[PDB]
Design a protein around this ligand. Structure first.
Ligand SMILES: C[S@@+](CC[C@H](N)C(=O)[O-])C[C@H]1O[C@@H](n2cnc3c(N)ncnc32)[C@H](O)[C@@H]1O
Ligand SMILES: O=[N+]([O-])c1cc(O)c(O)c([N+](=O)[O-])c1
Ligand SMILES: [Mg+2]
Length: 214
């Protein structure tokens, strides 16, 4: 229990039910709201993530920024057999926690965790990971990467008509350059979902940006 991330994992291992994704999510959200705040998308914004997945029904989903595995577990529990969630995480210590969290929650057969920076892995997705085009992307890494990685996904041929981009924290801490680009571009159709910062009462929101073709 030397780091906050280790303490979150240990709380799950001691209080949640093995193989039960819902139980894992509830243990993380309770510990973080009351004992140690952490940057998981959380239970309130997580209901918005769930609704986007339920409506669009992606089969190939990419996540940028895994942290401790909360959002990977939350999205994977909604996917159909044979779906794939690929999640990219730059920090090795967080990647090791994420794989343990995914294993414990019972969702490992749906998840492929990649250790590395988003901008190094994105150009490898077709030839090394067998991706054709993505159905959905969850953007939740450092906010200065949202716009350059959106441009890189397009340049690498990974977006099709109907691909869903869903971005966390577009208000707090904010992603203004990303928002101005997708909202002004004729290549995206955008919807804003206003909510709150995880575990707290500061206002936040997510943006859904649906690709329309080049
Ligand atoms: C907000 S946390 C992710 C929270 C996770 N989506 C959830 O809701 O449970 C952001 C993460 O992005 C990772 N990160 C930052 N820059 C990155 C990059 N260029 N590629 C991949 N991961 C990155 C950080 O190390 C950190 O674990
Ligand atoms: O500082 N914060 O409140 C957050 C919240 C978040 O949900 C984040 O994703 C974040 N980050 O990636 O830097 C920071
Ligand atoms: Mg976030």
């Amino acid at each position: 229990g030397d780091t906050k991330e280790q303490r979150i994992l240990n709380h799950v291992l001691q209080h949640a039910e093995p193989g039960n994704a819902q139980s894992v999510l509830e243990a993380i959200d309770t510990y973080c709201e009351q004992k140690e705040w952490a940057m998981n998308v959380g239970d309130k914004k997580g209901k918005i993530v769930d609704a986007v997945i339920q409506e669009h029904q992606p089969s190939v989903l990419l996540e940028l920024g895994a942290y401790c595995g909360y959002s990977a577990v939350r999205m994977a529990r909604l996917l159909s057999p044979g779906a794939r969630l690929i999640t990219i995480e730059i920090n090795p210590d967080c990647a090791a926690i994420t794989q343990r969290m995914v294993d414990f929650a019972g969702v490992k057969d749906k998840v492929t965790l990649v250790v590395g920076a988003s901008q190094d892995i994105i150009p490898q997705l077709k030839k090394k990971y067998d991706v054709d085009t993505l159905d959905m992307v969850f953007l939740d890494h450092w906010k200065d990467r949202y716009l350059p990685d959106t441009l890189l996904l397009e340049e690498c041929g990974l977006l099709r008509k109907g691909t869903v981009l869903l971005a966390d924290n577009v208000i707090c801490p904010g992603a203004p350059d990303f928002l101005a680009h997708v909202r002004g571009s004729s290549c995206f159709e955008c919807t804003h979902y206003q909510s709150f910062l995880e575990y707290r009462e500061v206002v936040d929101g997510l943006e859904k940006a649906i690709y329309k073709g080049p």
